[PDB]
Amino acid sequence: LICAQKFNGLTVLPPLLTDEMIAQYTSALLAGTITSGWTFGAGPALQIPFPMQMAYRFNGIGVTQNVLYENQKLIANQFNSAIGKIQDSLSSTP
Amino acid sequence: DSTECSNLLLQYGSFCTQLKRALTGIAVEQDKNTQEVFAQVKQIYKTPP
Amino acid sequence: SALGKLQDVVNHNAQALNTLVKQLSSKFGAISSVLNDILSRLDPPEAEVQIDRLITGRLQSLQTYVTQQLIRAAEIRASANLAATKMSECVLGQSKRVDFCGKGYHLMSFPQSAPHGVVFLHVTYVPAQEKNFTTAPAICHDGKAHFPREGVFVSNGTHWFVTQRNFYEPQIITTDNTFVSGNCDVVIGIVNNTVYDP
Amino acid sequence: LTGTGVLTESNKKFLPFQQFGRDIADTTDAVRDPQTLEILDITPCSFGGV
Amino acid sequence: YTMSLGAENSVAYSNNSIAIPTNFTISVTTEILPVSMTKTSVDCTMYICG
Ligand SMILES: *[C@@H]1O[C@H](CO)[C@@H](O[C@@H]2O[C@H](CO)[C@@H](O)[C@H](O)[C@H]2NC(C)=O)[C@H](O)[C@H]1NC(C)=O
Ligand SMILES: *[C@@H]1O[C@H](CO)[C@@H](O[C@@H]2O[C@H](CO)[C@@H](O)[C@H](O)[C@H]2NC(C)=O)[C@H](O)[C@H]1NC(C)=O
Ligand SMILES: *[C@@H]1O[C@H](CO)[C@@H](O[C@@H]2O[C@H](CO)[C@@H](O)[C@H](O)[C@H]2NC(C)=O)[C@H](O)[C@H]1NC(C)=O
Ligand SMILES: *[C@@H]1O[C@H](CO)[C@@H](O)[C@H](O)[C@H]1NC(C)=O
Ligand SMILES: *[C@@H]1O[C@H](CO)[C@@H](O)[C@H](O)[C@H]1NC(C)=O
């Protein structure tokens, strides 16, 4: 059984990074992406407004800068909605 | 925990030093794997309130 | 421990070899490790049982050595392919893949041979001396929103300027730095400076 | 001590009480001549894959 | 001590604030990679039954 892992000469070492510290790493990685775009991954983190940042991500795939701003309300409602369904997507399919 | 059995192992070779070293090397790797994936930021960034 | 990765490779294979020879001493349940002694002490009809017992434990050490060598060889193959992959990308060119060739924006990569490996000198670009400025998504002039062709609209707090993202060269907002797209009542957060047409 | 090797002169010094002389293994890398009490330097014959 | 991930830092995010570098640093890091291990060969007959 997994409750008593000792058994007979079978020790399960604990991970060096606890689930809490890993969550701190992920949260620090989320806050870097949101508040700094990619600049935090290549030196110091430089703050940039998120609507402005995602225009730069748009500009990197071909669509011009102004496509995002003229569709900010639609795009945000699209993102929000999707990030939602992803929670039920994992729940629906075990 | 049989002394007679343990006497046969020490005549059997140094397989254990190979096994426990292999599983120790496999143990350090797991710590390195999580470090490589996640520890990509030298600072802990905080979301604004 | 700078050259830790190569040092362990030299340690691992050498110590694996040293265990293999050291495996020869164990008697494996036989009378003696030295098989010439067994052939001299015991008669041939009853020395095979001791010889066979020694052989079974002996080749099994070879089986372990080869198997762990095959696994280790596969690990180096992945490491060699990664080095070959980033020899072609980081050295023979410039890589846009973030944090692939050195942390920061990559410029160059000079390799150097090392014993049983390679060493890369990733010449990266790291910004510094950051300054906090007030930005704006666009700049309405005549009711028509202006978006920068390159860079970002930035304001020293008094005037507006357009500068590239990774370096601060404030340039006056002409009509060549920016492009027009539609009226300026649909962009959220638009400021309203004046675009000097050249 | 029965084996096969290239008997040769050894610069090693076998302290009086030191009979044989293994190395970092188990191989009698040296022997003291029963007679003439000389330190030999038994080394394996030069084999090799072809 | 309990491990510390790193120096906690808060980014001054704001609807209308941008941070732009006025300088750079040409940092030359280094990367070490194994390429080839030691080519070893064995002989069963000379090893198992000398
Ligand atoms: C911000 O805008 C500009 C940038 O320096 C400054 O206005 C300048 O003032 C000098 C003073 O002689 C004159 O050349 C012009 O009036 C401007 N020239 C430029 C565009 O450099 C202004 O003083 C700055 N103010 C702040 C808040 O930094
Ligand atoms: C930016 O400046 C323009 C140019 O004056 C402003 O347009 C006028 O602003 C006044 C003041 O609110 C209004 O009474 C007028 O009706 C506006 N004219 C137009 C074109 O509708 C504009 O409102 C300013 N925008 C911001 C962000 O303050
Ligand atoms: C960018 O940084 C470099 C150094 O990292 C600065 O160059 C230094 O300038 C000071 C001037 O006060 C000199 O005393 C140093 O000797 C210089 N060092 C080097 C290595 O050149 C440079 O001035 C910075 N750029 C700006 C615009 O401030
Ligand atoms: C810029 O302003 C923000 C907010 O006031 C502050 O957190 C940051 O340290 C400032 N940076 C510089 C270089 O002054
Ligand atoms: C500006 O920033 C504040 C604090 O981050 C936020 O609550 C507010 O909604 C923003 N206003 C706009 C729309 O610029």
Coordinates of C-alpha atoms and ligand atoms in Angstrom, one line a residue:
Chain A
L1 CA 0.0 0.0 0.0
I2 CA 1.0 3.6 -0.5
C3 CA 0.3 4.6 3.1
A4 CA 3.1 2.6 4.6
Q5 CA 5.8 2.8 1.9
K6 CA 8.6 1.5 4.2
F7 CA 7.9 -2.2 3.5
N8 CA 11.1 -4.2 3.5
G9 CA 14.3 -2.3 2.6
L10 CA 12.2 0.0 0.3
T11 CA 12.6 3.7 1.3
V12 CA 10.9 6.4 -0.8
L13 CA 13.0 9.6 -0.5
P14 CA 11.1 12.8 -0.4
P15 CA 11.6 15.3 -3.2
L16 CA 14.0 18.2 -2.6
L17 CA 11.4 20.8 -3.7
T18 CA 8.1 20.5 -1.9
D19 CA 4.8 21.0 -3.6
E20 CA 4.5 24.3 -1.9
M21 CA 7.9 25.6 -3.2
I22 CA 7.1 24.4 -6.7
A23 CA 3.8 26.3 -6.5
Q24 CA 5.8 29.4 -5.5
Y25 CA 8.0 28.8 -8.6
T26 CA 5.0 28.6 -10.9
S27 CA 3.3 31.6 -9.3
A28 CA 6.5 33.6 -9.7
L29 CA 6.6 32.4 -13.3
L30 CA 3.0 33.5 -13.9
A31 CA 3.6 37.0 -12.4
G32 CA 6.6 37.4 -14.6
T33 CA 4.7 36.6 -17.8
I34 CA 1.8 38.8 -16.9
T35 CA 3.5 41.9 -15.6
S36 CA 6.7 41.7 -17.7
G37 CA 6.0 39.8 -20.9
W38 CA 9.2 38.0 -22.0
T39 CA 11.6 40.7 -20.7
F40 CA 12.0 38.8 -17.3
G41 CA 13.2 35.8 -19.1
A42 CA 16.1 37.6 -20.7
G43 CA 17.5 39.9 -18.0
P44 CA 15.7 42.3 -15.7
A45 CA 11.9 42.4 -15.6
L46 CA 10.5 45.5 -17.3
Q47 CA 6.8 46.2 -16.5
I48 CA 4.5 46.6 -19.5
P49 CA 0.7 47.0 -19.6
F50 CA -0.8 43.7 -20.5
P51 CA -3.0 45.0 -23.4
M52 CA 0.2 46.5 -24.7
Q53 CA 2.1 43.3 -24.1
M54 CA -0.3 41.1 -26.0
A55 CA -0.2 43.5 -29.0
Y56 CA 3.5 42.7 -29.1
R57 CA 2.6 39.0 -29.0
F58 CA 0.1 39.7 -31.8
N59 CA 2.8 41.6 -33.8
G60 CA 5.0 38.5 -33.5
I61 CA 2.6 36.2 -35.4
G62 CA 1.9 38.6 -38.3
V63 CA -1.3 40.4 -37.3
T64 CA -0.7 44.1 -37.0
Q65 CA -0.6 46.0 -33.7
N66 CA -4.0 47.6 -34.1
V67 CA -5.9 44.3 -34.5
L68 CA -5.7 43.7 -30.8
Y69 CA -6.6 47.2 -29.6
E70 CA -9.7 47.4 -31.8
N71 CA -10.7 44.0 -30.6
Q72 CA -9.5 44.1 -27.0
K73 CA -13.0 43.6 -25.5
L74 CA -13.7 40.6 -27.8
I75 CA -10.3 39.1 -27.4
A76 CA -10.4 39.3 -23.6
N77 CA -13.8 37.8 -23.5
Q78 CA -12.5 35.0 -25.8
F79 CA -9.4 34.3 -23.6
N80 CA -11.4 34.5 -20.3
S81 CA -14.0 32.1 -21.7
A82 CA -11.4 29.6 -22.9
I83 CA -9.3 29.6 -19.7
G84 CA -12.6 28.8 -18.0
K85 CA -13.6 25.8 -20.2
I86 CA -10.1 24.3 -19.5
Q87 CA -11.0 23.6 -15.9
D88 CA -14.1 21.6 -16.9
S89 CA -12.2 20.0 -19.8
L90 CA -9.9 18.2 -17.3
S91 CA -12.8 17.4 -15.0
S92 CA -15.0 16.1 -17.9
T93 CA -12.3 13.7 -19.2
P94 CA -10.6 11.8 -16.3
Chain B
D1 CA 18.2 -9.8 8.9
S2 CA 19.9 -13.2 8.9
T3 CA 23.6 -13.1 9.6
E4 CA 24.2 -16.3 7.7
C5 CA 22.6 -14.9 4.6
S6 CA 24.6 -11.7 4.9
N7 CA 27.8 -13.8 4.9
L8 CA 26.8 -15.1 1.4
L9 CA 26.4 -11.6 0.0
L10 CA 29.8 -10.4 0.9
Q11 CA 31.2 -13.5 -0.9
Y12 CA 28.8 -12.7 -3.8
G13 CA 30.4 -9.4 -4.9
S14 CA 29.9 -5.7 -4.9
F15 CA 26.5 -5.7 -6.7
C16 CA 24.9 -3.7 -3.9
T17 CA 27.4 -0.8 -4.3
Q18 CA 26.4 -0.8 -7.9
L19 CA 22.7 -0.9 -7.1
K20 CA 22.6 1.7 -4.4
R21 CA 24.9 4.0 -6.5
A22 CA 22.6 3.5 -9.5
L23 CA 19.5 4.4 -7.4
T24 CA 21.4 7.3 -5.8
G25 CA 22.2 8.6 -9.3
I26 CA 18.6 8.1 -10.3
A27 CA 17.6 10.1 -7.2
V28 CA 19.8 13.2 -7.8
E29 CA 18.5 13.3 -11.4
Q30 CA 14.9 13.6 -10.2
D31 CA 15.9 16.7 -8.1
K32 CA 17.8 18.1 -11.1
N33 CA 14.8 17.6 -13.4
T34 CA 12.4 19.6 -11.2
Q35 CA 15.1 22.3 -10.8
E36 CA 15.7 22.6 -14.5
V37 CA 12.0 22.9 -15.4
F38 CA 10.9 25.3 -12.7
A39 CA 13.9 27.2 -11.3
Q40 CA 14.1 29.4 -14.4
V41 CA 13.8 32.7 -12.5
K42 CA 16.3 34.0 -10.1
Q43 CA 13.6 36.2 -8.4
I44 CA 10.1 35.5 -7.1
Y45 CA 7.9 37.9 -8.9
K46 CA 4.7 39.1 -7.1
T47 CA 1.4 39.8 -8.7
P48 CA 0.1 43.3 -8.0
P49 CA -2.7 43.5 -5.4
Chain C
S1 CA 32.9 22.2 -10.3
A2 CA 32.6 24.3 -13.5
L3 CA 33.4 21.3 -15.6
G4 CA 31.2 19.0 -13.6
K5 CA 29.4 17.5 -16.5
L6 CA 32.5 16.2 -18.3
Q7 CA 34.2 15.2 -15.1
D8 CA 31.5 12.8 -14.0
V9 CA 31.5 11.1 -17.5
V10 CA 35.2 10.4 -17.0
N11 CA 34.4 9.2 -13.4
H12 CA 31.4 7.1 -14.3
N13 CA 32.9 5.0 -17.1
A14 CA 36.3 4.6 -15.3
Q15 CA 34.7 3.6 -12.0
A16 CA 32.3 1.3 -13.9
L17 CA 35.4 -0.4 -15.4
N18 CA 37.1 -0.5 -12.0
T19 CA 34.0 -2.3 -10.5
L20 CA 34.1 -4.8 -13.4
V21 CA 37.7 -5.8 -12.7
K22 CA 37.0 -5.7 -8.9
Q23 CA 34.1 -8.1 -9.7
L24 CA 36.6 -10.7 -10.6
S25 CA 37.8 -11.2 -7.0
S26 CA 34.5 -12.3 -5.6
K27 CA 34.3 -16.1 -5.3
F28 CA 30.6 -16.1 -6.3
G29 CA 30.2 -19.1 -4.0
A30 CA 33.0 -21.1 -5.5
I31 CA 36.2 -22.2 -3.7
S32 CA 38.5 -19.5 -5.0
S33 CA 38.4 -16.6 -7.4
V34 CA 41.5 -17.7 -9.3
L35 CA 40.3 -20.4 -11.7
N36 CA 43.8 -21.7 -12.2
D37 CA 43.9 -22.6 -8.5
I38 CA 40.6 -24.5 -8.9
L39 CA 42.0 -26.5 -11.8
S40 CA 45.0 -27.4 -9.6
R41 CA 43.2 -28.2 -6.3
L42 CA 40.2 -30.1 -7.4
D43 CA 40.1 -32.9 -9.9
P44 CA 38.6 -32.0 -13.3
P45 CA 35.4 -34.2 -12.9
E46 CA 34.4 -32.2 -9.7
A47 CA 35.9 -28.9 -10.6
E48 CA 33.3 -28.0 -13.3
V49 CA 30.7 -27.4 -10.6
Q50 CA 33.0 -24.8 -9.1
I51 CA 34.0 -23.5 -12.5
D52 CA 30.4 -23.3 -13.7
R53 CA 29.4 -21.5 -10.4
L54 CA 32.2 -19.0 -11.1
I55 CA 31.3 -18.5 -14.7
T56 CA 27.6 -17.7 -14.0
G57 CA 28.5 -15.0 -11.6
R58 CA 31.3 -13.7 -13.9
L59 CA 29.5 -13.2 -17.1
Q60 CA 26.5 -11.8 -15.2
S61 CA 28.9 -9.0 -14.2
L62 CA 29.6 -8.4 -17.9
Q63 CA 25.8 -8.4 -18.5
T64 CA 25.4 -5.7 -15.9
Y65 CA 28.3 -3.7 -17.2
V66 CA 27.1 -3.8 -20.8
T67 CA 23.5 -3.0 -19.8
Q68 CA 24.5 0.0 -17.7
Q69 CA 26.9 1.1 -20.5
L70 CA 24.2 0.9 -23.1
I71 CA 21.9 3.1 -21.0
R72 CA 24.8 5.5 -20.3
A73 CA 25.6 5.5 -24.0
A74 CA 22.1 6.5 -24.8
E75 CA 22.2 9.3 -22.3
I76 CA 25.4 10.7 -24.0
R77 CA 23.7 10.2 -27.4
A78 CA 20.9 12.6 -26.2
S79 CA 23.5 15.0 -24.8
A80 CA 25.6 14.7 -28.0
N81 CA 22.5 15.4 -30.2
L82 CA 21.6 18.4 -28.0
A83 CA 25.1 19.7 -28.5
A84 CA 25.0 19.1 -32.2
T85 CA 21.6 20.7 -32.3
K86 CA 22.8 23.8 -30.6
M87 CA 26.1 23.8 -32.5
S88 CA 24.1 24.3 -35.7
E89 CA 21.7 26.9 -34.2
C90 CA 23.8 28.9 -31.7
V91 CA 27.1 28.9 -33.6
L92 CA 26.3 28.5 -37.3
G93 CA 23.5 31.1 -36.9
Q94 CA 21.5 33.2 -34.5
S95 CA 18.8 31.5 -32.4
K96 CA 15.5 33.2 -31.4
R97 CA 14.7 30.3 -29.1
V98 CA 14.7 31.9 -25.6
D99 CA 17.2 30.7 -23.1
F100 CA 18.5 28.1 -25.6
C101 CA 21.9 29.6 -26.1
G102 CA 22.7 31.5 -22.9
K103 CA 20.3 33.6 -20.8
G104 CA 19.3 36.8 -22.6
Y105 CA 19.1 37.7 -26.2
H106 CA 21.6 35.6 -28.1
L107 CA 24.2 37.1 -30.5
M108 CA 27.1 34.7 -30.9
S109 CA 28.3 31.3 -29.8
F110 CA 32.0 30.4 -29.9
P111 CA 32.6 26.7 -29.2
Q112 CA 35.7 25.2 -27.6
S113 CA 36.8 21.6 -27.6
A114 CA 36.9 19.9 -24.2
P115 CA 38.0 16.4 -23.3
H116 CA 35.0 14.2 -24.1
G117 CA 32.7 17.1 -24.7
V118 CA 32.2 20.6 -26.0
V119 CA 32.1 24.0 -24.3
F120 CA 30.0 26.9 -25.7
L121 CA 30.6 30.6 -25.1
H122 CA 27.2 32.1 -25.6
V123 CA 27.6 35.8 -26.2
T124 CA 24.2 37.1 -25.1
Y125 CA 22.7 40.6 -24.9
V126 CA 21.3 41.7 -21.5
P127 CA 19.5 45.0 -21.1
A128 CA 20.2 47.2 -18.0
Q129 CA 19.6 50.7 -16.7
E130 CA 15.9 50.4 -17.1
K131 CA 13.8 53.5 -16.8
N132 CA 10.1 53.8 -15.9
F133 CA 8.1 55.7 -18.5
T134 CA 4.4 56.4 -19.1
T135 CA 3.2 54.7 -22.3
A136 CA 0.1 54.7 -24.4
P137 CA -1.4 52.1 -26.9
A138 CA -1.9 54.7 -29.6
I139 CA -1.9 58.5 -30.2
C140 CA -5.0 60.2 -31.7
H141 CA -4.1 63.3 -33.7
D142 CA -6.9 64.3 -36.1
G143 CA -9.4 61.8 -34.8
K144 CA -7.5 58.9 -36.4
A145 CA -5.5 56.6 -34.1
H146 CA -1.8 56.3 -34.8
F147 CA 0.0 53.1 -33.9
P148 CA 3.8 52.9 -34.0
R149 CA 5.3 50.9 -36.9
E150 CA 8.1 49.8 -34.6
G151 CA 8.7 50.3 -30.9
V152 CA 6.4 51.9 -28.4
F153 CA 5.0 55.3 -27.6
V154 CA 6.7 56.6 -24.5
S155 CA 6.4 59.9 -22.6
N156 CA 9.2 61.6 -20.6
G157 CA 6.2 63.0 -18.6
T158 CA 6.0 66.1 -20.7
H159 CA 6.3 65.1 -24.3
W160 CA 5.6 61.9 -26.2
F161 CA 8.1 60.0 -28.3
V162 CA 8.4 56.6 -30.1
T163 CA 11.4 54.3 -29.2
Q164 CA 12.2 50.7 -29.9
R165 CA 11.4 48.3 -27.1
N166 CA 14.8 47.1 -26.1
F167 CA 16.7 50.4 -26.2
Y168 CA 15.7 54.0 -25.3
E169 CA 16.1 56.3 -28.3
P170 CA 13.2 58.8 -28.0
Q171 CA 12.3 59.9 -31.5
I172 CA 9.6 62.5 -32.3
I173 CA 6.3 60.9 -33.4
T174 CA 6.4 61.6 -37.1
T175 CA 4.1 60.0 -39.6
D176 CA 6.8 57.6 -40.7
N177 CA 7.3 56.1 -37.3
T178 CA 3.5 55.4 -37.0
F179 CA 0.6 54.2 -39.1
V180 CA -3.0 55.2 -39.1
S181 CA -5.9 52.8 -38.6
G182 CA -9.5 54.0 -38.1
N183 CA -10.9 56.5 -35.8
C184 CA -9.6 57.0 -32.2
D185 CA -12.8 56.5 -30.3
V186 CA -12.5 52.7 -30.2
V187 CA -8.9 52.2 -28.7
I188 CA -9.0 51.8 -25.0
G189 CA -6.4 54.1 -23.3
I190 CA -5.5 56.3 -26.3
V191 CA -3.6 59.6 -25.5
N192 CA -3.9 62.6 -27.8
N193 CA -0.5 64.2 -28.8
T194 CA 0.3 65.6 -32.2
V195 CA 2.1 63.6 -35.0
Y196 CA 4.6 65.8 -36.8
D197 CA 4.2 64.9 -40.4
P198 CA 7.6 65.3 -42.1
Chain D
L1 CA 51.4 -19.0 -7.6
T2 CA 50.7 -20.4 -11.0
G3 CA 49.9 -18.1 -14.0
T4 CA 51.0 -16.7 -17.3
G5 CA 52.9 -13.4 -17.7
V6 CA 56.0 -11.6 -18.9
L7 CA 58.4 -12.0 -16.0
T8 CA 60.6 -8.9 -15.8
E9 CA 62.9 -6.9 -13.5
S10 CA 61.0 -4.7 -11.0
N11 CA 62.2 -1.5 -9.4
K12 CA 59.6 -2.0 -6.7
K13 CA 61.0 -2.6 -3.1
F14 CA 59.4 -5.6 -1.3
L15 CA 60.0 -5.0 2.5
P16 CA 61.7 -8.2 3.9
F17 CA 58.4 -9.6 5.2
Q18 CA 56.6 -8.8 1.9
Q19 CA 56.2 -12.1 0.0
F20 CA 54.0 -11.5 -3.1
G21 CA 52.6 -8.2 -4.4
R22 CA 49.1 -7.6 -5.7
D23 CA 48.0 -4.2 -7.1
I24 CA 44.7 -2.1 -7.2
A25 CA 42.8 -5.3 -8.2
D26 CA 43.9 -8.8 -7.2
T27 CA 46.5 -9.5 -9.8
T28 CA 49.9 -10.6 -8.5
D29 CA 51.6 -7.6 -10.2
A30 CA 54.8 -8.9 -8.7
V31 CA 56.5 -12.0 -7.0
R32 CA 59.7 -12.5 -5.0
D33 CA 61.7 -15.3 -6.6
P34 CA 61.6 -18.3 -4.1
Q35 CA 65.4 -18.4 -4.7
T36 CA 67.6 -15.3 -5.3
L37 CA 64.8 -13.4 -3.5
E38 CA 64.4 -11.1 -6.4
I39 CA 61.4 -8.7 -6.9
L40 CA 60.0 -9.6 -10.4
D41 CA 57.3 -7.6 -12.2
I42 CA 54.8 -10.2 -13.5
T43 CA 52.7 -8.5 -16.2
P44 CA 50.1 -10.1 -18.5
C45 CA 51.2 -11.1 -22.0
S46 CA 50.4 -8.6 -24.7
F47 CA 47.0 -9.8 -26.1
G48 CA 44.6 -7.6 -28.1
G49 CA 41.7 -7.8 -30.5
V50 CA 42.5 -8.1 -34.2
Chain E
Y1 CA 18.1 26.5 6.9
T2 CA 15.0 26.1 4.8
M3 CA 15.7 26.6 1.1
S4 CA 15.0 30.0 -0.3
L5 CA 14.0 30.1 -4.0
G6 CA 15.3 33.6 -4.6
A7 CA 15.1 37.3 -3.8
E8 CA 11.4 38.2 -3.7
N9 CA 10.7 41.0 -6.1
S10 CA 7.5 42.8 -7.0
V11 CA 7.1 44.3 -10.5
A12 CA 5.5 47.8 -10.5
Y13 CA 2.8 46.9 -13.0
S14 CA 0.4 49.7 -14.0
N15 CA -2.2 50.3 -16.8
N16 CA 0.0 53.0 -18.3
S17 CA 3.6 52.3 -17.2
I18 CA 6.4 51.0 -19.4
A19 CA 10.0 50.2 -18.4
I20 CA 12.6 50.6 -21.2
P21 CA 16.4 49.9 -20.8
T22 CA 18.7 52.7 -21.5
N23 CA 21.8 50.5 -21.6
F24 CA 22.9 46.9 -22.1
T25 CA 25.5 44.3 -21.0
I26 CA 27.2 41.9 -23.4
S27 CA 27.3 38.9 -21.0
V28 CA 29.3 35.9 -22.2
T29 CA 28.0 32.9 -20.3
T30 CA 29.4 29.3 -20.8
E31 CA 27.8 25.9 -21.4
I32 CA 29.3 22.5 -20.9
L33 CA 28.1 19.5 -22.8
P34 CA 29.4 15.9 -22.9
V35 CA 29.8 14.6 -26.4
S36 CA 31.5 11.2 -26.5
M37 CA 32.3 8.8 -23.7
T38 CA 35.2 6.4 -23.6
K39 CA 35.2 3.7 -26.2
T40 CA 35.7 0.4 -24.3
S41 CA 36.0 -3.1 -25.6
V42 CA 35.9 -6.4 -23.8
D43 CA 36.9 -10.0 -24.5
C44 CA 34.7 -12.6 -22.9
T45 CA 37.2 -15.5 -23.2
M46 CA 40.1 -13.4 -21.8
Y47 CA 37.8 -12.1 -19.0
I48 CA 35.5 -15.0 -17.9
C49 CA 37.9 -17.8 -18.4
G50 CA 41.5 -16.4 -18.5
Ligands
LIG1 C1 10.5 66.1 -21.6 O1 10.4 66.4 -23.0 C2 11.5 67.0 -23.5 C3 12.6 65.9 -23.6 O2 13.8 66.4 -23.0 C4 12.0 68.3 -22.8 O3 11.7 69.4 -23.6 C5 12.9 69.8 -24.2 O4 13.4 71.0 -23.5 C6 14.5 71.6 -24.2 C7 15.0 72.7 -23.3 O5 15.7 73.6 -24.0 C8 14.2 72.1 -25.6 O6 15.1 71.6 -26.5 C9 12.8 71.6 -25.9 O7 11.8 72.3 -25.2 C10 12.6 70.1 -25.7 N1 13.5 69.3 -26.5 C11 13.5 68.0 -26.5 C12 12.4 67.3 -27.2 O8 14.4 67.3 -26.0 C13 11.2 68.4 -21.5 O9 11.8 69.4 -20.7 C14 11.2 67.1 -20.7 N2 10.5 67.3 -19.4 C15 10.6 66.3 -18.5 C16 9.4 66.2 -17.6 O10 11.5 65.5 -18.5
LIG2 C1 -7.7 64.4 -26.9 O1 -7.8 65.6 -27.6 C2 -8.9 65.7 -28.6 C3 -8.7 67.0 -29.3 O2 -9.2 68.1 -28.6 C4 -10.2 65.7 -27.8 O3 -11.3 65.9 -28.6 C5 -12.2 66.9 -28.1 O4 -12.1 66.9 -26.7 C6 -13.0 67.9 -26.1 C7 -12.7 67.9 -24.6 O5 -13.3 66.7 -24.0 C8 -14.4 67.5 -26.4 O6 -15.3 68.4 -25.9 C9 -14.6 67.4 -27.9 O7 -15.9 67.0 -28.3 C10 -13.6 66.5 -28.5 N1 -13.7 66.4 -30.0 C11 -13.9 65.3 -30.6 C12 -13.1 65.0 -31.7 O8 -14.8 64.5 -30.2 C13 -10.3 64.4 -27.1 O9 -11.4 64.3 -26.3 C14 -9.0 64.2 -26.2 N2 -9.1 62.8 -25.6 C15 -8.7 62.6 -24.3 C16 -8.1 61.2 -24.1 O10 -8.7 63.5 -23.5
LIG3 C1 26.3 51.8 -20.0 O1 27.1 51.1 -19.1 C2 28.5 51.3 -19.3 C3 29.2 50.4 -18.4 O2 28.5 49.2 -18.1 C4 28.8 52.8 -19.1 O3 30.2 53.0 -19.4 C5 30.8 53.6 -18.2 O4 30.6 55.0 -18.2 C6 31.1 55.6 -17.0 C7 30.8 57.1 -17.0 O5 30.4 57.6 -15.7 C8 32.7 55.4 -16.9 O6 33.2 55.9 -15.7 C9 33.0 53.9 -17.0 O7 34.4 53.8 -17.2 C10 32.3 53.3 -18.3 N1 32.6 51.9 -18.3 C11 32.7 51.2 -19.5 C12 32.9 49.7 -19.4 O8 32.6 51.8 -20.6 C13 28.0 53.6 -20.0 O9 28.2 55.0 -19.7 C14 26.5 53.3 -19.8 N2 25.7 54.1 -20.7 C15 25.0 55.2 -20.3 C16 24.2 55.9 -21.3 O10 25.1 55.6 -19.1
LIG4 C1 9.9 53.3 -11.6 O1 8.7 53.5 -10.9 C2 8.1 52.4 -10.2 C3 6.8 52.8 -9.6 O2 7.0 54.0 -8.8 C4 9.2 51.9 -9.2 O3 8.7 50.7 -8.5 C5 10.5 51.6 -9.9 O4 11.5 51.2 -8.9 C6 11.0 52.8 -10.7 N1 12.2 52.5 -11.4 C7 13.2 53.4 -11.4 C8 14.4 53.0 -12.2 O5 13.2 54.5 -10.9
LIG5 C1 -5.8 51.5 -13.6 O1 -5.1 50.8 -12.6 C2 -5.9 50.5 -11.4 C3 -5.0 49.8 -10.5 O2 -4.1 48.8 -11.1 C4 -7.1 49.6 -11.9 O3 -7.8 49.3 -10.7 C5 -7.9 50.4 -12.8 O4 -9.0 49.6 -13.3 C6 -7.1 50.9 -14.0 N1 -7.9 51.8 -14.8 C7 -7.9 51.9 -16.1 C8 -9.0 51.4 -16.9 O5 -6.9 52.5 -16.7

